[PDB]
Design a protein around this ligand. Sequence first.
Ligand SMILES: [Mg+2]
Ligand SMILES: [Mg+2]
Lengths: 452, 452
Amino acid sequence: MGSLEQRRLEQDKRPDDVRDEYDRDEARLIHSAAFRRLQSKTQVLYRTRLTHSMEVAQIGRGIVQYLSKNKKFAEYHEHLPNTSLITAICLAHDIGHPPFGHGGEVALNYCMREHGGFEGNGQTLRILGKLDKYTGEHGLNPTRRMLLGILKYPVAYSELVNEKAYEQVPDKNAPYWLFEARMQKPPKCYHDCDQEIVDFIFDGFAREELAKFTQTEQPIDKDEPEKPLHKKSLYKSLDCTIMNLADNISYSLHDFEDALSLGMITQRHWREHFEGKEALFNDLAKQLVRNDLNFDLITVNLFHKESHCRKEAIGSLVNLMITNAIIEKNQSGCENPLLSLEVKLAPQIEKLRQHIFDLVCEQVIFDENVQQLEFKGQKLVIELFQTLAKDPNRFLPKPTRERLKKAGEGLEGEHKKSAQLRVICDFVSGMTDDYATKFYEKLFTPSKGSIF
Amino acid sequence: MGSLEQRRLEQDKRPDDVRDEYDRDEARLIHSAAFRRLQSKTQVLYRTRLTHSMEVAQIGRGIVQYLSKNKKFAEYHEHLPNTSLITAICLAHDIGHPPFGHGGEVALNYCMREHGGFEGNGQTLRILGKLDKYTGEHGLNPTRRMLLGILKYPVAYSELVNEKAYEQVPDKNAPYWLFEARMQKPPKCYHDCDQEIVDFIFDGFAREELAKFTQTEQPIDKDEPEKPLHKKSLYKSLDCTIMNLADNISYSLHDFEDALSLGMITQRHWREHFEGKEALFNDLAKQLVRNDLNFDLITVNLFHKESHCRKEAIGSLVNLMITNAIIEKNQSGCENPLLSLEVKLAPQIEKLRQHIFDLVCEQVIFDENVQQLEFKGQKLVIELFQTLAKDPNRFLPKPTRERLKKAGEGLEGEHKKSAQLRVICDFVSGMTDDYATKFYEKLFTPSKGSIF
Ligand SMILES: [Mg+2]
Ligand SMILES: [Mg+2]
């Protein structure tokens, strides 16, 4: 089998470069157009995706550091990623996310219904492995282990999608962009047209390991037992578990901290969301003997006037989760360490992390005004994709027109159409929020737009 | 003397934390309000200060890595900073820069003429050591070595300023914000009101070392020999030399790369700026035997249609400077390694780096439209500072009103005034470009502004 430091394309380093291949991955990523676009992309609307990706990289390094010295896990030290690989994986995890976030993701998936759908994490793999113009046709040409580390869902769209969930009540009067977004969310997956990339990631493993590692589950009873739902992938690589843990800690605490600052989560919300289960903080305070973890003391410090009393509690909770990162084996039958080993929190810490994250989804993610803005990004992307798809040679830039022509060669009929719509999907998804707004305004908004 | 890992305020780590003090500095910085503000701050206007600071951190780590293995410099390996310290120093170097960049810096220095002036690098030290609300009154409370690493100019404003350079031809008809900005630029320095911070940084050194390390020079003949000019500090710490080298590589190549993309630097500009001295590339190509360094070959790749041919040359030039980082001793009489040792490029590489950077200043920094926008930031900040200074209790937020009251206590007369204007200067300088624009529009622009 192939090495983990192997790339799809041959790009050997000069003898002047003792940097390991994982550092070369970090260097290419930071100097890449896909990573620099994280500035003009916000996840909530304040906090940009670049800042979130840096905080996630910091948390992941702290996780890897904590594990690399805890001798209870000394048996697994050799399989931990290094500082450069965990950073590059953490800094790349939100690269594929489209403009306007979930509003744009639902939009592109709805437009690509007959052509493979769209999902952000799949586009992250698509950009990293092919789209980014660091190479001709191999993206940034990352190492096998880095590609595996960003593959959060190693199962294809077709193998996971349940198109019965897309079913809608007919409405002759509704425009094409007007629908319930929750019923058009894609499965978390990789795109079928990128199977070659996934083949490379998995050529360094035994095929029985691949079958066990790509196992899925059928979730049941989201509201009713017969409600149709997509299938979920079940397992991620070891490095991916570390990044996914850091990614959730930031969403649970750092987006919570921003919610306190903006006033979207009050102490009344806190004490009502924790009206029961004050032991989520208190019982932990007893076991670890940390008076700072007392529910009433940490509540006063979180909702304190002095900003140094809040950041001290946020950082205390950030440190509490990093110090409670355990590494177990997943219920996959895999014997490879990178496929069988998982990093996660202590069960009592995860209960507290989730319960803080649930208050964030309730007051921030599902705020009426936040959702109204997501729908507008849905309308904008749909209306932009339609127009770019109706006459792509009139509107698209010349290099994008070349890819669309190139994608259709050797293909005819419906396969040619899906391959060319994929290029348009990669063009729109690779837009920044302001670039997509300007592109919308040049095409539709009455008095806006300039030829330069 | 005191240790380099010592902080002004006592904030010892728990036994659960094996992170070194320099990693704790990196962790606090990333989760700090001052570092997160780098998203909404651009240096040129595209590339944000956050992205520039990440690229600088990457270059610095590559420099430290290259030096930590080159055995010609093995005698100095023990004095190199670690990965966390060089990152925190690189990620913090542009924290103090005000809104609208040099336009805002000239603005604040002009307003603070009688009250100590303003300079960005000084505010970086002021934020890191006192202003940031991570602690009560000690900022992020960084280690002594990190504070030293961001102290680019270890000489005070008063000791360097030449107020004859501020002299202006009288103009009764000109508004207060209308002046030549070049004649009101401050010296590169630290603010006199922050001498206590600088005292702490230097208590870990012998006083003779401090006198030699804080030596200055009087530059002569900017245009004419008798043209008045500020004095310059002469020496930086070892870690600061590494950060300052990375900071200049990014400005010389990464801002050059953006200039190619936006069309602000043409191949005609390149071949005319290099009409002579093609040997800046070619002679290096002969010594290192690198055909890619041929002037005509690298020109075709830099100004190529394929974006992978440009990024390959930019990264080749980024790698060429990192591989030519030498560490010598400065002409300071210092015997401490952190004060006597400097990191810099090979003389022939610096000639090429500077000559590329000169084309960036000519076509980008001094573009007429870029300068027109800088002046507008100058007008906006001046008009905002004046109004905030005329009635600070009517306009400033309550916490900022508390600091201004607190800064004036124990003082009367002109010293009280300068101390309270310093708080207003810290408030404006700590604004983001959009926050300062909204604050300007609430106060002056006819139909804009909301009470929320
Ligand atoms: Mg994320
Ligand atoms: Mg800089």
